[PDB]
CSV table of C-alpha atoms and ligand atoms in Angstrom, one decimal:
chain,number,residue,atom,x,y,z
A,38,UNK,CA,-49.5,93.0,-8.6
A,39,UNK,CA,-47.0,91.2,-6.6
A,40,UNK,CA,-43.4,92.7,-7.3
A,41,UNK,CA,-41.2,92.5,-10.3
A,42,UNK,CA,-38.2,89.9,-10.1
A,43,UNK,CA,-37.0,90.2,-13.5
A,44,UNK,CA,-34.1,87.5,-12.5
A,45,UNK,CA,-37.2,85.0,-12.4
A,46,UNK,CA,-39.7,86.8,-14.6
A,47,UNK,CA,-41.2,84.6,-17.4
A,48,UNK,CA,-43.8,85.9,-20.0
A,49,UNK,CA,-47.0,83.4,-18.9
A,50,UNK,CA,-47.7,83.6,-22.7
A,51,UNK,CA,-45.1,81.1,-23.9
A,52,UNK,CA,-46.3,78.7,-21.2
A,53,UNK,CA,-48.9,76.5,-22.5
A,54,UNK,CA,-50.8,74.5,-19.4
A,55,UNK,CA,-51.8,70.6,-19.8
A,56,UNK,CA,-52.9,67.9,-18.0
A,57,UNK,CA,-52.9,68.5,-14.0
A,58,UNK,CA,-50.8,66.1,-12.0
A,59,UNK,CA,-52.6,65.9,-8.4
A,60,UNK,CA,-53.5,68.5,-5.7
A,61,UNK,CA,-51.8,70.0,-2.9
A,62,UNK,CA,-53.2,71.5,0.5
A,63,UNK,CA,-52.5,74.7,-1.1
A,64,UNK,CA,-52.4,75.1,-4.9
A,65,UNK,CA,-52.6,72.4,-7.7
A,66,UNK,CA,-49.7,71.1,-10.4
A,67,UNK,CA,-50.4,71.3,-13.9
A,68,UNK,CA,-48.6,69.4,-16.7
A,69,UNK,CA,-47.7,72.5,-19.4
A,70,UNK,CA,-45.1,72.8,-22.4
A,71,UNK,CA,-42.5,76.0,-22.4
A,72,UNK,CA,-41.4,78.0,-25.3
A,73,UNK,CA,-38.0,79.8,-24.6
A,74,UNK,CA,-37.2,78.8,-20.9
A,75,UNK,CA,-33.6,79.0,-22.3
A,76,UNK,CA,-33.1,83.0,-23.9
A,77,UNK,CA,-30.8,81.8,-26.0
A,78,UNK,CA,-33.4,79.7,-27.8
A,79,UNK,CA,-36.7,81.9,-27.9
A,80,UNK,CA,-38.5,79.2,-30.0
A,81,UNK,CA,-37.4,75.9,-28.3
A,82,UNK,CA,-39.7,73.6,-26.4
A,83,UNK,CA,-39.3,72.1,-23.3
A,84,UNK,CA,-41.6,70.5,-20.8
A,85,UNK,CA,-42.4,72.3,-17.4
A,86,UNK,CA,-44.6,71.7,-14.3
A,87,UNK,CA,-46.5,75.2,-12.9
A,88,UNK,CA,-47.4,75.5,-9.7
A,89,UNK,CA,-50.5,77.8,-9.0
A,90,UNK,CA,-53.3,78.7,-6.9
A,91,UNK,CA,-56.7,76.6,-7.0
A,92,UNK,CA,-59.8,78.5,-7.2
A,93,UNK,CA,-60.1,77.2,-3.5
A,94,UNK,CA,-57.5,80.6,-3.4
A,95,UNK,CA,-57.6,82.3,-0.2
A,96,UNK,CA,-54.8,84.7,1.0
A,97,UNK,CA,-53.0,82.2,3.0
A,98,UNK,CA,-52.8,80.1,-0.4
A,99,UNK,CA,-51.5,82.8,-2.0
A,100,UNK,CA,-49.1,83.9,1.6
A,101,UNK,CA,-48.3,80.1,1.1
A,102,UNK,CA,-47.6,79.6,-2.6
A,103,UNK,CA,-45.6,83.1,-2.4
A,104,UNK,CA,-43.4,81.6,0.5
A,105,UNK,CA,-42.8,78.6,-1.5
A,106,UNK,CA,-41.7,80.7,-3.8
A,107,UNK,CA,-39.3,82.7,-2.3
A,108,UNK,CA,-37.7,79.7,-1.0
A,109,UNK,CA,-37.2,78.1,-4.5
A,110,UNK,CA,-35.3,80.9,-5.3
A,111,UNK,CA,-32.7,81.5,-2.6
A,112,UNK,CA,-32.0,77.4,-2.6
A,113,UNK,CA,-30.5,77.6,-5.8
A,114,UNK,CA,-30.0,75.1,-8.4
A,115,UNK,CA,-28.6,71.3,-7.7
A,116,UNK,CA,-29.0,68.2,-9.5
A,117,UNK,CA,-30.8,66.3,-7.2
A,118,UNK,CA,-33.4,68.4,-6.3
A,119,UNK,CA,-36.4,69.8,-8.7
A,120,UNK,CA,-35.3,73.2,-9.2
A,121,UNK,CA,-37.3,76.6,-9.7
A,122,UNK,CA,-37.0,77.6,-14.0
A,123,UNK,CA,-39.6,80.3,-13.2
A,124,UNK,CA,-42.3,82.3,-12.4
A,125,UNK,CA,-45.4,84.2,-13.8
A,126,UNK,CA,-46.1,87.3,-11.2
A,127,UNK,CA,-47.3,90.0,-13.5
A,128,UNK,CA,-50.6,90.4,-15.3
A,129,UNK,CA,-52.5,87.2,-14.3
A,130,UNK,CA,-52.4,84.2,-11.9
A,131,UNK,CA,-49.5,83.2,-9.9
A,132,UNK,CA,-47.1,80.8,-11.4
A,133,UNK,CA,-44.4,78.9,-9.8
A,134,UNK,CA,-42.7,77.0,-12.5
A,135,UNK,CA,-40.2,73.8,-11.7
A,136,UNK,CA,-38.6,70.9,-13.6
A,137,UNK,CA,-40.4,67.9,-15.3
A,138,UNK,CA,-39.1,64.5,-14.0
A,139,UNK,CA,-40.6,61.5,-16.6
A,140,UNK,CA,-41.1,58.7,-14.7
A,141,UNK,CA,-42.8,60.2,-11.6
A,142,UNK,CA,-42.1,59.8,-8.0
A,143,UNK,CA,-39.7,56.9,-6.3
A,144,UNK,CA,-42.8,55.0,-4.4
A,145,UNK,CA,-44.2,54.2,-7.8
A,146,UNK,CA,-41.3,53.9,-10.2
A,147,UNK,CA,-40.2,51.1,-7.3
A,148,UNK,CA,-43.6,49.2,-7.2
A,149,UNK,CA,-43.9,49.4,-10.8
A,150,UNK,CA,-40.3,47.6,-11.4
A,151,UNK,CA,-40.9,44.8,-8.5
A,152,UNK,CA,-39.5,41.5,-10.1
A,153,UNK,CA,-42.1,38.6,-11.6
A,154,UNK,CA,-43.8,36.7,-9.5
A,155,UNK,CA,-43.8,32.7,-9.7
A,156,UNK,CA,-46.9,33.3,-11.8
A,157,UNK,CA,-45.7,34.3,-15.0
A,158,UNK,CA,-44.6,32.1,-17.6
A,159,UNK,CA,-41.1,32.2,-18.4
A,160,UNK,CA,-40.3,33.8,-21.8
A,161,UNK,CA,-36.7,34.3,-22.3
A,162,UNK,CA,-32.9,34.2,-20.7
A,163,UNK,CA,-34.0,37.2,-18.6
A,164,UNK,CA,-37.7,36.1,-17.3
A,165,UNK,CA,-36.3,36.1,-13.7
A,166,UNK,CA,-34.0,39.1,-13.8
A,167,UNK,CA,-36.0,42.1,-12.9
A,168,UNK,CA,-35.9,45.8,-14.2
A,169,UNK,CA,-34.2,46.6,-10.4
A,170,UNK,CA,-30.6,45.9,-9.5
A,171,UNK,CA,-28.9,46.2,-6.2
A,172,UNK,CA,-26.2,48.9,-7.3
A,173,UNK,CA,-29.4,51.1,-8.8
A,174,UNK,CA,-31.5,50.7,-5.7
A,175,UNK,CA,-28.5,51.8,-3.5
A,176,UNK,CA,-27.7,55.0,-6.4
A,177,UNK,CA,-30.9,56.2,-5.4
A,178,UNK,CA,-30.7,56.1,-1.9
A,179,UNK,CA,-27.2,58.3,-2.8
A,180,UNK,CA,-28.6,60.4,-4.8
A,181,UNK,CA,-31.5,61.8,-2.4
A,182,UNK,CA,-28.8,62.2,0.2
A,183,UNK,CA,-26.9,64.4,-1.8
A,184,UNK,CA,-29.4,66.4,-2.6
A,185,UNK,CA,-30.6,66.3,1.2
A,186,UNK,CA,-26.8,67.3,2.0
A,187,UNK,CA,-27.4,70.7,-0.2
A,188,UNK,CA,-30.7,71.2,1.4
A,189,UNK,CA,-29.1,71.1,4.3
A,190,UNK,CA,-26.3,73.2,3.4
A,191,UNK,CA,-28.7,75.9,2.4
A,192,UNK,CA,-30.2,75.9,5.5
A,193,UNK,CA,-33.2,74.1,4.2
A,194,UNK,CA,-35.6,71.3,5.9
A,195,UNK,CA,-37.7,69.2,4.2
A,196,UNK,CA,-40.3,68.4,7.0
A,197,UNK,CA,-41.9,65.4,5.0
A,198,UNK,CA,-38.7,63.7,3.4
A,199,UNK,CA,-40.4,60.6,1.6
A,200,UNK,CA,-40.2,58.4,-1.8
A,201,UNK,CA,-43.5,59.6,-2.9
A,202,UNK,CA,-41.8,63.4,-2.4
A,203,UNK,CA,-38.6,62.1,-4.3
A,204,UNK,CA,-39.1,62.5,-8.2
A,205,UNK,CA,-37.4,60.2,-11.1
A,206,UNK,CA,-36.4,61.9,-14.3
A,207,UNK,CA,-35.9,59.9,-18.1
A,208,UNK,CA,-32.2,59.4,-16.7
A,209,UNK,CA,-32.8,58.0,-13.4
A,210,UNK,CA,-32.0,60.8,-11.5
A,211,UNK,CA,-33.6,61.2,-8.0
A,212,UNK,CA,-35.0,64.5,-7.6
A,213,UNK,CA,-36.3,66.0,-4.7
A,214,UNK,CA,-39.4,67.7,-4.9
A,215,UNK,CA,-41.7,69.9,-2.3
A,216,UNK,CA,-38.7,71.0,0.0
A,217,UNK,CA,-39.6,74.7,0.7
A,218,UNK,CA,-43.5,74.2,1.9
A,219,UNK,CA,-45.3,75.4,4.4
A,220,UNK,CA,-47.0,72.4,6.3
A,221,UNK,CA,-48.6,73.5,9.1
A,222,UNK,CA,-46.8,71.7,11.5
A,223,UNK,CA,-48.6,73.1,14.3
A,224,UNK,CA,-51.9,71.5,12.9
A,225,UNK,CA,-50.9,68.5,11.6
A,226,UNK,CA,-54.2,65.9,11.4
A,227,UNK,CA,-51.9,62.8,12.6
A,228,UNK,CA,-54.2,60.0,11.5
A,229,UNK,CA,-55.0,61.5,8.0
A,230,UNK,CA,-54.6,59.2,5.4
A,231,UNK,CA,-53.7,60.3,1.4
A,232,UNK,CA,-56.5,59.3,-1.7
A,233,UNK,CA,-53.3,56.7,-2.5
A,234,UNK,CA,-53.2,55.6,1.5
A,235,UNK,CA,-50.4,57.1,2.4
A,236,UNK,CA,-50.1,57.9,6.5
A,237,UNK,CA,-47.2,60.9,6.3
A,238,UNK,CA,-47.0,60.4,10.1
A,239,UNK,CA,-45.0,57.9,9.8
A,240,UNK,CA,-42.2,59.5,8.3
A,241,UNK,CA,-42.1,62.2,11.4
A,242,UNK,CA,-38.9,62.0,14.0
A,243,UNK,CA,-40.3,61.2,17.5
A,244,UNK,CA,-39.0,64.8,18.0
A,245,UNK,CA,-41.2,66.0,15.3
A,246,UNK,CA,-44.3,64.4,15.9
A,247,UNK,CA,-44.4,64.2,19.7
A,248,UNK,CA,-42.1,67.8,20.8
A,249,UNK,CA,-43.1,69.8,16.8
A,250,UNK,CA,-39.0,69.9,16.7
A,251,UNK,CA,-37.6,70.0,13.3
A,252,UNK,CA,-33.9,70.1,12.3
A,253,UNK,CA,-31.9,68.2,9.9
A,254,UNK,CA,-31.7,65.5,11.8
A,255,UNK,CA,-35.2,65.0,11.8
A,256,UNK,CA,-35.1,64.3,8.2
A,257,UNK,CA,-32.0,62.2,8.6
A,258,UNK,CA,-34.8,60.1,10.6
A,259,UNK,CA,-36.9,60.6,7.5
A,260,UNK,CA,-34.6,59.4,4.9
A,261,UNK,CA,-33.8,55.9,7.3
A,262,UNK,CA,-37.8,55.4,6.3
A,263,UNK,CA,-37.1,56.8,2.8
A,264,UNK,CA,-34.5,53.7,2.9
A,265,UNK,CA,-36.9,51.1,4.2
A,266,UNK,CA,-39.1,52.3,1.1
A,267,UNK,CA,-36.4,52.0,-1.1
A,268,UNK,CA,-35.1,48.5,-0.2
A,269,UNK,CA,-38.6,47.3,-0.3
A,270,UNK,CA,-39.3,48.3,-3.7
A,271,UNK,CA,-41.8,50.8,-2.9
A,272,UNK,CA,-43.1,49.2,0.4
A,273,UNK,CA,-45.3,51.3,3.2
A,274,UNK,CA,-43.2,51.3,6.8
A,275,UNK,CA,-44.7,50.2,9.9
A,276,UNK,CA,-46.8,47.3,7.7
A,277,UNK,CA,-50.3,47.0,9.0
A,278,UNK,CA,-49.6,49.1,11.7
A,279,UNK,CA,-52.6,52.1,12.7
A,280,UNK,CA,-51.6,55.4,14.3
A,281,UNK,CA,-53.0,55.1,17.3
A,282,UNK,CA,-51.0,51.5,17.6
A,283,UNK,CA,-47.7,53.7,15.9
A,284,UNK,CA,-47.9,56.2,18.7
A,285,UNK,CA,-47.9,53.8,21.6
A,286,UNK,CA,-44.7,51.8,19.6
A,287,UNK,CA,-42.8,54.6,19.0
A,288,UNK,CA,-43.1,56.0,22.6
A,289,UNK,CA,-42.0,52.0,23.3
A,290,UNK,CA,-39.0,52.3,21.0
A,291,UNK,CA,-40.4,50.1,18.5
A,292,UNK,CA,-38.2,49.8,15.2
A,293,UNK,CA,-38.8,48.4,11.4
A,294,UNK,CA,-37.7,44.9,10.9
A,295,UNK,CA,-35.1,44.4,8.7
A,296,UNK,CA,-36.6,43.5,4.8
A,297,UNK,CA,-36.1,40.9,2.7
A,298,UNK,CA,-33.0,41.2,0.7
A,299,UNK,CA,-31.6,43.5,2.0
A,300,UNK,CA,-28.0,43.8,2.8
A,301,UNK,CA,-27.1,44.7,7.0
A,302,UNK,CA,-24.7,47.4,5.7
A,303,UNK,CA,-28.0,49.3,4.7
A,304,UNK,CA,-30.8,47.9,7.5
A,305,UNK,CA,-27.4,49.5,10.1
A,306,UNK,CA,-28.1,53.0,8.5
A,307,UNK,CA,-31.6,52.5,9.0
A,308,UNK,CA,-31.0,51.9,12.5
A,309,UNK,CA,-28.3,54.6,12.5
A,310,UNK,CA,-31.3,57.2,11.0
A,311,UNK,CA,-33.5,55.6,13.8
A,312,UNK,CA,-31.6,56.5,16.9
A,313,UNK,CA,-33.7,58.6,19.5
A,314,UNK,CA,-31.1,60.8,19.8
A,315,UNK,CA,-30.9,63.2,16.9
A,316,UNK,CA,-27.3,63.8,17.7
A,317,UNK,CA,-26.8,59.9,17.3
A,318,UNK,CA,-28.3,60.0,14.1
A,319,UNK,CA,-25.5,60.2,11.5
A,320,UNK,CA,-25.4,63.8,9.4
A,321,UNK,CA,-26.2,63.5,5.8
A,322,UNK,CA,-22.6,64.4,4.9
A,323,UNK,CA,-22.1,60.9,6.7
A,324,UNK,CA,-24.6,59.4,5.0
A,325,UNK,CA,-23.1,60.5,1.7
A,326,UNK,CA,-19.9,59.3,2.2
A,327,UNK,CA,-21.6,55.9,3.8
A,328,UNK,CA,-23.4,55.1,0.8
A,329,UNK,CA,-20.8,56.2,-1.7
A,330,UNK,CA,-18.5,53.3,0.0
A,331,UNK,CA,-21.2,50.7,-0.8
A,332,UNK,CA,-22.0,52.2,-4.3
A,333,UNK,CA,-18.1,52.4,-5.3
A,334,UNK,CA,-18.2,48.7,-4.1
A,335,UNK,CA,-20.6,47.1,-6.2
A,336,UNK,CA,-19.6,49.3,-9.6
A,337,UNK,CA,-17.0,47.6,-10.6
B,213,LIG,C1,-43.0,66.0,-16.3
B,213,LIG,C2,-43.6,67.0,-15.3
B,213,LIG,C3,-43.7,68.5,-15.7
B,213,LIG,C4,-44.9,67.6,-15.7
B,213,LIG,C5,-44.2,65.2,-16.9
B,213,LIG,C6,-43.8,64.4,-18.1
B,213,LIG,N1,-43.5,63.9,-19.0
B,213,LIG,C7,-44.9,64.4,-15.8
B,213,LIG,O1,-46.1,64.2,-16.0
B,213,LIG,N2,-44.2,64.0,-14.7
B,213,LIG,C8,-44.8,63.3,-13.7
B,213,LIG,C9,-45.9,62.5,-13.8
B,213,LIG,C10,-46.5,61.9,-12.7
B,213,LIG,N3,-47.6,61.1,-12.8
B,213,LIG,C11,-47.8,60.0,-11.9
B,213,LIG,C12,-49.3,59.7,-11.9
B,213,LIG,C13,-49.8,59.2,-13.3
B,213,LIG,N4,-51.2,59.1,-13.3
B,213,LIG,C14,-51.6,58.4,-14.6
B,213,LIG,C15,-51.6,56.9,-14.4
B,213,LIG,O2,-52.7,56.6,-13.5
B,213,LIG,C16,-53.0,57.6,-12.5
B,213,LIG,C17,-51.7,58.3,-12.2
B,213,LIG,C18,-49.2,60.1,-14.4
B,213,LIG,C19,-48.6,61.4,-13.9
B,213,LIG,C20,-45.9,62.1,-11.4
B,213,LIG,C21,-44.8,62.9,-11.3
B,213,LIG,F1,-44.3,63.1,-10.1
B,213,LIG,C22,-44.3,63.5,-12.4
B,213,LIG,N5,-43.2,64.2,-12.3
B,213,LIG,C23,-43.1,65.5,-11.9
B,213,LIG,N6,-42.2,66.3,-12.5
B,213,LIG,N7,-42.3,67.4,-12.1
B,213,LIG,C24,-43.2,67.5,-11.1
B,213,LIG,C25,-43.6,68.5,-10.4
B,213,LIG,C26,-44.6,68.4,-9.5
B,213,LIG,C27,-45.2,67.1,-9.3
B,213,LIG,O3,-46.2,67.0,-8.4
B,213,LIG,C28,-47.1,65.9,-8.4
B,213,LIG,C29,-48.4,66.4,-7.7
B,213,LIG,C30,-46.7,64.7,-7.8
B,213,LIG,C31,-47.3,63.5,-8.3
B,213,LIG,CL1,-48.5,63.6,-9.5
B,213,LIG,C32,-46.9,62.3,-7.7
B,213,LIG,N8,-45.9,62.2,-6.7
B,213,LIG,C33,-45.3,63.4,-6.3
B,213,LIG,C34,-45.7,64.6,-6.8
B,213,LIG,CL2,-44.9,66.0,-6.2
B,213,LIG,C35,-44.8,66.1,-10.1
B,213,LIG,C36,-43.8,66.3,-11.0
C-alpha cells in the first residue's frame, strides 16, 4: 500500500525471518536468511537483518519506520556503516532490510576480549597476551570516524553515536548502525536506563542535552566518549556517576579521567571531542586524518 520503489523492491518471499535480535522504541530486528539479494545469483544465500513494525504498530511507528527508511536510501552505500540491501513495501508488513555484522556491537565484542585476569592459570607462551592489541583498538576508533566523515558528508547526524550503536562484522570491520532514526529528541526521558544499563545521556553534547542542538559536532562530542569506550575495552563513561550528579558536572565542566593504558595522543582527542565549544571540537575529517597518523605509526 505504500508506493513502489522498484530500485529497493525485494520479493518478501525469498526472505526467511529467524531469531529476533532486541527491540527498538519503534519496531523490532529479526535475524532472517536471503535468497537472491544479489540478481545475478537468484538462488544464493546470504544472511540479512529486517527491520519491521511490532505489533505495538501505531501510525507514528509506521511514519517512523518509513522515515528511517527513506533515509537509508538517500545515504547510500559505505563500508563503515550498515547499509540498506532492501525493502518489502508491497503485499504485507513493512520490511527494512540491512547488513548482518557477526560478532555484534563494539561495547560487547570489547568486554568479551578484555585480557586474563591474575586469576587464571597460565597455559601457554601466549596466557598473558590478550585477543586486543593497541594498533586494532586504534583501527576501530578510525574506522567509525570514517564512516562518521560520510555521514557527515551526506548531511547525516547520528544523534546517539555510541559503541553499543557501532556493529563488528566476521572481518573486523566497524559498522555503524541506527544513523537515520527518529529519536524524539524533544522528549527524551534523561534518566532512563537500558535492560543492559546503559544511560544514553551520557553520550549527548552539553549543546544537545541542555539547548536540544544537534550538528556534527555534537557527535564529534559523541565519538570522544565512543573513544573512552574504546580504550577501556568496553567501559561505561562517567563511572558510578547518576544523572542527576552528571547534570550538575557537566554544567561544572567536569571531564573523564584519562584510562588506564592509554596513550595521551588519544586521551588529547578525547579532550579535543570534549571542548564546550562545538567549533573547538576538531571535524571528523580531522579526526580521520588524526588517527590515521597514529594507525600508520604502529603498522609497521
Ligand atoms: C548478523 C545480523 C543479520 C542478523 C547475525 C549473524 N550471524 C547476528 O545475529 N548479528 C548480531 C548479533 C547480535 N547479538 C548480540 C546479542 C547476543 N545474544 C545472545 C547471547 O546472550 C544474549 C545476547 C546474540 C545476538 C548483535 C548484533 F549487533 C548483531 N549484528 C547485527 N547485524 N546486523 C544488525 C542489525 C541490527 C542489529 O540490531 C540489534 C538490535 C542490536 C543488538 Cl542485538 C545489539 N547491539 C546493537 C544493535 Cl543495533 C544488530 C545487527
Amino acid at each position: 500500500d505504500l508506493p513502489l520503489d522498484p530500485l529497493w523492491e525485494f520479493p518478501r518471499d525469498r526472505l526467511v525471518l529467524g531469531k529476533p535480535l532486541g527491540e527498538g522504541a519503534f519496531g523490532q530486528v529479526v535475524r532472517a536468511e536471503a535468497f537472491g539479494m544479489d540478481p545475478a545469483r537468484p538462488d544464493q544465500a546470504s544472511t540479512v537483518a529486517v527491520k519491521m513494525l511490532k505489533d505495538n504498530a501505531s501510525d507514528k511507528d509506521l511514519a517512523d519506520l518509513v522515515s528511517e527508511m527513506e533515509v537509508m536510501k538517500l545515504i547510500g552505500r559505505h563500508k563503515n556503516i550498515i547499509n540498506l540491501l532492501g525493502v518489502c513495501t508491497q503485499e504485507g508488513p513493512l520490511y527494512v532490510i540491512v547488513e548482518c555484522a557477526a560478532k555484534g556491537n563494539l561495547r560487547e565484542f570489547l568486554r568479551a576480549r578484555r585480557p586474563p585476569g591474575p586469576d587464571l592459570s597460565p597455559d601457554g607462551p601466549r596466557s598473558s597476551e590478550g585477543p586486543l592489541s593497541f594498533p586494532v583498538l586504534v583501527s576501530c576508533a578510525y574506522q567509525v570516524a570514517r564512516g562518521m566523515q560520510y555521514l557527515e558528508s551526506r548531511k547525516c547526524i547520528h544523534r546517539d553515536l555510541a559503541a553499543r550503536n557501532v556493529l563488528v562484522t566476521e572481518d573486523n570491520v566497524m559498522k555503524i548502525a541506527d544513523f537515520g532514526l527518529a529519536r524524539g529528541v524533544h522528549h527524551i526521558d534523561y534518566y532512563k536506563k537500558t535492560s543492559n544499563g546503559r544511560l544514553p545521556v551520557k553520550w549527548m553534547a552539553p549543546e544537545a542535552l541542555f539547548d536540544e542542538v544537534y550538528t556534527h559536532q555534537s557527535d564529534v562530542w559523541s565519538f570522544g566518549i565512543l573513544l573512552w569506550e574504546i580504550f577501556t575495552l568496553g567501559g561505561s563513561p562517567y563511572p558510578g556517576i547518576p544523572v542527576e550528579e552528571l547534570f550538575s558536572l557537566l554544567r561544572e565542566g567536569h571531564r573523564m579521567d584519562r584510562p588506564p593504558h592509554c596513550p595521551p595522543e588519544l586521551y588529547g582527542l578525547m579532550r579535543e571531542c570534549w571542548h564546550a565549544a562545538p567549533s573547538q571540537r576538531p571535524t571528523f575529517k580531522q579526526l580521520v586524518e588524526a588517527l590515521d597518523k597514529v594507525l600508520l605509526a604502529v603498522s609497521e
